[PDB]
Each structure stands twice: as C-alpha cells, then as structure tokens.
C-alpha cells in the first residue's frame, strides 16, 4: 500500500510534508458498504503510480467527523486537494486510478505523450 492512513490524532502534522509535489490529495470515506469499497483498490493503485509525484491519503468520516463536517464532505467517497497543506478545493475527474493520474498528466506535461 502507498496511501497515507491519516487520523485526527496526526493529520495536522502530515499535510506539512508537502513541497516537491506542490500539494496533497485525500479521499474521505466510511467503513459501510458502498462505492468507497469499489474505489479503494483503484485509489491504492493511483498512490503507487504517483508515489514521487502526488501524495495520496484516506480518512474515515465516521471516525473523523469533526474534520469532515468542517470540510463539507457530507457523503462518500469524496476526494479533495490541499496545495502546500492548505485547501485548493476538490478533485475533478473519473472515480478511477486513471482519473487521478490523468488529472496530474494534464498539468505536469501533456505534450509528446
């Protein structure tokens, strides 16, 4: 696994590890059955594909509800973006590993692909 498994106990220290990647990506989810179980093995694969390019993380909204209601998660799976460890807005692509990598390639260097 390559996804960070952050919590309210330590999240506030790990978003500051950003610099070379410019940002951190995170998925808010829950332990209940749903599209989060179908997307988890794709989001794991994105973190392997982007390990030195875009940091990826996961957070349980049922266990970190105080962060997730302040962040306006309100449902799951819910992907968000934090430039230099501070809110840039939200993810904007397919719910697949290919979507995460494509959203990077489109700004990192789409020429000569």
UniProtKB/Swiss-Prot annotation:
Identify residues that carry N6-methyllysine.
37
* Post-translational modification N6-succinyllysine, affected residues: 105
Q: Where is this site: Contributes to redox potential value?
A: 34-35
Residues at the active site: 33 (nucleophile), 36 (nucleophile)
Out of the domains of life, which is the source? Eukaryota
- Which cysteines form disulfides? 33-36, 61-68
What is this protein's tissue specificity according to the annotation? Detected in the flagellum and head region of spermatozoa (at protein level). Expressed in liver, stomach and colon (at protein level). Expressed in gastric parietal cells and chief cells (at protein level).
What changing residue 36 to S does, per the record, is: Activity changed to serine protease
Q: How is it modified after translation?
A: Within the major histocompatibility complex class I (MHC I) peptide loading complex forms reversible disulfide-linked heterodimers with TAPBP as part of its protein folding chaperone activity. This is essential to assist the dynamic assembly of the MHC I complex with high affinity antigens in the endoplasmic reticulum. Phosphorylated.
Per UniProt, residues of the Thioredoxin domain are 1-109
Site (Lowers pKa of C-terminal Cys of first active site) residue list: 95
Instruction: Name where it's found.
Output: Endoplasmic reticulum; Endoplasmic reticulum lumen; Melanosome
Subunit record text: Part of the major histocompatibility complex class I (MHC I) peptide loading complex composed of TAP1, TAP2, B2M, MHC heavy chain, TAPBP, PDIA3, and CALR. Interacts with ERP27 and CANX. Interacts with SERPINA2 and with the S and Z variants of SERPINA1. Interacts with ATP2A2.
Role noted for this protein: Protein disulfide isomerase that catalyzes the formation, isomerization, and reduction or oxidation of disulfide bonds in client proteins and functions as a protein folding chaperone. Core component of the major histocompatibility complex class I (MHC I) peptide loading complex where it functions as an essential folding chaperone for TAPBP. Through TAPBP, assists the dynamic assembly of the MHC I complex with high affinity antigens in the endoplasmic reticulum. Therefore, plays a crucial role in the presentation of antigens to cytotoxic T cells in adaptive immunity.
Please give the family membership noted in the entry: Belongs to the protein disulfide isomerase family.
Its recorded name reads Protein disulfide-isomerase A3
Please indicate which part of the intact protein appears here, giving the first and last residue numbers and the full length.
Answer: 25 to 137 of 505
